[PDB]
Amino acid sequence: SLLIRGATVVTHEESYRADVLCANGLIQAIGENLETPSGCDVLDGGGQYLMPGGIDPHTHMQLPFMGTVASEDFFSGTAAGLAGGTTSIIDFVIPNPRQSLLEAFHTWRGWAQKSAADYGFHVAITWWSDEVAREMGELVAQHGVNSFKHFMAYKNAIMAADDTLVASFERCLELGAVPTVHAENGELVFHLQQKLLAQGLTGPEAHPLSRPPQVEGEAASRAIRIAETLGTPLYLVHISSREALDEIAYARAKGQPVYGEVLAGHLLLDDSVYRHPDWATAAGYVMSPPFRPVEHQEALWRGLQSGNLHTTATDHCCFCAEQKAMGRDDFSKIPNGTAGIEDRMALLWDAGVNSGRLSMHEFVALTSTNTAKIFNLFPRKGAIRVGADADLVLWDPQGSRTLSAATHHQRVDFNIFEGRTVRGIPSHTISQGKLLWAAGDLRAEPGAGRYVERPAYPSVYEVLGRRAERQRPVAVER
Amino acid sequence: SLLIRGATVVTHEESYRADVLCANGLIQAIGENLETPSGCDVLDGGGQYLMPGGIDPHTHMQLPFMGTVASEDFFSGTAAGLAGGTTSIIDFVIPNPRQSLLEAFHTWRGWAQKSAADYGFHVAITWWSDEVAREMGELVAQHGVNSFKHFMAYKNAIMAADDTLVASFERCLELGAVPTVHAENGELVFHLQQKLLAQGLTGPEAHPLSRPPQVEGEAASRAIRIAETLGTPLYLVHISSREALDEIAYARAKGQPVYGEVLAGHLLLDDSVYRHPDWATAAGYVMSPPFRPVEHQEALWRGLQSGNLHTTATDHCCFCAEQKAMGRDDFSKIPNGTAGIEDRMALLWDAGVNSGRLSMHEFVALTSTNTAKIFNLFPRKGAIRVGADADLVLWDPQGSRTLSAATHHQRVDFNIFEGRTVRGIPSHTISQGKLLWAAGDLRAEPGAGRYVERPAYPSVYEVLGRRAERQRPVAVER
Ligand SMILES: Nc1c[nH]c(=O)[nH]c1=O
Ligand SMILES: [Zn+2]
Ligand SMILES: [Zn+2]
Ligand SMILES: [Zn+2]
Ligand SMILES: [Zn+2]
């Protein structure tokens, strides 16, 4: 048993002073001046905020990708996420083309067994056949998967063309699963990569030039309108561009269920990072989509404030300087990805709440509750109520931290926010009711985390259902 | 020679009283009370408006298509255009996949020699290879073509996927040619067509359901964004939807050279036409894009008024009842297309000018001058000025005409505006300085029209070149 006493509870919609009791991995009681069970550890949260633990729905722990394997494994990644107040992740099963999905799924369950905190998976659809359609049904019915990932970029690899997107989205509808998309036009990226290389522009500064923001806006428009035509919801991962955000807003203004996810990097960094004089420094920012001219950061913030972006994530995909250097002579070969699982919540609090573009309640909604709702984990997760998983974070608004690769718990030799000082840190992280991060001490244990099943048919599917019934076609009688 | 006396000259920007003298196919003199050369014919235009003859940039005379050949041929179609005030067309060479473009071009020249008025061609890119790219250059350099058409629908036929779109648009940029696009997502069309057929919805009412508006908005988005990425202008044919119009307005607002074309059918008809209890009547409206719910008509009129739609055309593609009946058990086999070359100008005048939606100057811009400027034919066409081609229409603002398949000159048994009465009609049409339509008397002759060459590099390409030079990628030395 673990009792957090004297703090202010901050949810996605309200604040109030109360104590919180956890036991057996669940939240047992909430209230002022709670009784203390015998032999129950006590945590003093005076002057701090008690919030749901962060959920990161976009991580790539130890992903084999672009000629190599990510430097962060499932244990060091989930542990680092605990240090930064994040208590569960959704990662990605990425089968190779013509490789079986259940095969990939069990393989990934294997790798993820070492997780120190709760974890789940999105399954990517990297090819199509009647068997993928059948396997998708199995993953939802028997293995707790309720979301499928589609890559519109990475031509001559994992890219899903329109024919796949249509088939798979239609399958998700049948299964009550949520289609999710990496929205970049693969044909234009491939075309621009070759053209820049043929011009001899091989540095990291060519990476943004190879996939400018309209390449994302285009794919977002296409994913969104396939989803509209087939009558499914749609979740777009790491939106970086005004173009893509405007497409989401346009569809939502048409009341379509479209969600957008954003990373701290795309809220706070611009594309000048790729022109850094030092190659390894610039290479460190190479991910897709890339960082953008400053006007896109401001559009994304307004996306958060307006309700047109819905979740924060990290695309946590680490590669050390030596792996980055795999493309020292060809930006197209630099393994794509940045780290951020540990830094997401502090970064957003410091830039959003301290500044105050975001209220404390929006901070919560954007770091856990919205993700939980979208993927049908609410109120089990991202919620402070009796019966919910005891995933919590205690937040010192006056604590300070300076992000550096030399001191962060993420196993990677680079931090895209190196040297940045944030006011507002997680003093204590609580996962499954146990205190796994405390005032500098990390208590993560390999294998401590559970695999989290997400049930199919989130509530959006009931409204979609009624809509589809109103729109059934009537033949003309002749 | 031919002198038009006493009319009000109306251009794309102004109105003034003057006579106009034509001779040798050209406009010779403009001024009040011009002297009459001896032997010159005189036309009294008192109380009427003298405007440039209409240019219809979207016709398909005797096109072989969807199993058959359009009922209108190049003589009957251009003659019918003349009765309606339209003095020149741009048609489409549509090579079959793997067919040489040059081969198809010469064949089409044979088909079009019988035209009664000036004509030109757009050439469609229905497949890709190095030969295609070479033949595009030859068509521009030797054959007066400066625009290339791309079909984004017609899966498993003339459809261009992104790889062809990108390669062709790049070729277009190299040649100073205008890419034009039929913007519908073919994968979604094909998927919806089979779905609806599988459910037994075989009638014409399924045609609009098989290609809802967002299918067009998606393809407009994608064509527009490819164009932006490659640095070309872009011309989208027959825009029917708010979604597509919004994509054009959005790219035009970012400063991008995007032009939109609209048919009178999509300005004035709604999709209730496909539910007519008579099969032949409903089939008569079947074209792609289909006619839309009424809110899209309002949006289109608004595009015209705001400057986000730029040209009018007809997609003149005629099929009689027995030909339409090829799809009596399968709407996907109904040959797509409607008639309008003869009716476009009166329809737009009556609905746009009489209502005050459009000024008379906007009417001229939208029926001739904007098309001329976009395809590099201004001021040879669409302009009343000494030396311009003598293509003129004399317009009686209080004349009246009732549109009817029983009385029109279009060689087709269906009119999508059957029984509509319009106020403001062409009393006389002058082509190559000759009076070919004189209040009810059509004097069109087979073979009188000239093939019209269009020079490459319209003016927009000078601006694009200056932008490209400013945005040249620049490496970082390390
Ligand atoms: N060529 C065409 C004629 N008519 C149509 O409706 N669509 C076409 O693509
Ligand atoms: Zn991604
Ligand atoms: Zn990712
Ligand atoms: Zn068309
Ligand atoms: Zn057409």
Numbering used by the authors:
A (entry chain B), B (entry chain A): 2 to 479
What does the paper say about this structure?
Dihydropyrimidinase (DHPase) is a key enzyme for pyrimidine degradation. DHPase contains a binuclear metal center in which two Zn ions are bridged by a posttranslationally carbamylated lysine (Kcx). DHPase catalyzes the hydrolysis of dihydrouracil (DHU) to N-carbamoyl-β-alanine. On the basis of an analysis of the amino acid sequences, DHPase was suggested to be a member of the cyclic amidohydrolase family.
The complexed crystal structure of PaDHPase with 5-AU was determined at a 2.1 Å resolution. Two monomers of PaDHPase were found in the asymmetric unit. However, only one 5-AU molecule was found in the active site of one of the PaDHPase dimers. Similar to the apo form, the global architecture of the 5-AU-complexed PaDHPase monomer (subunit A) revealed a TIM-barrel structure embedding the catalytic dimetal center (Znα and Znβ) and a β-sandwich domain, consisting of 17 α-helices, 19 β-sheets, 2 Zn ions, and 1 5-AU molecule. The dimetal center in the PaDHPase-5-AU complex consisted of His59, His61, Kcx150, His183, His239, and Asp316 still self-assembles. Lys150 remains carbamylated (Kcx150) regardless of 5-AU binding. 5-AU interacts with Znα (3.2 Å), Znβ (3.0 Å), the main chains of residues Ser289 (2.8 Å) and Asn337 (3.3 Å), and the side chain of residue Tyr155 (2.8 Å). Dynamic loop I (amino acid residues Pro65-Val70) in PaDHPase is not involved in the binding of 5-AU. However, we found that 5-AU and 5-FU binding poses to PaDHPase are different in terms of orientation and binding residues. Znβ is not involved in binding 5-FU, whereas both Zn ions interact with 5-AU.
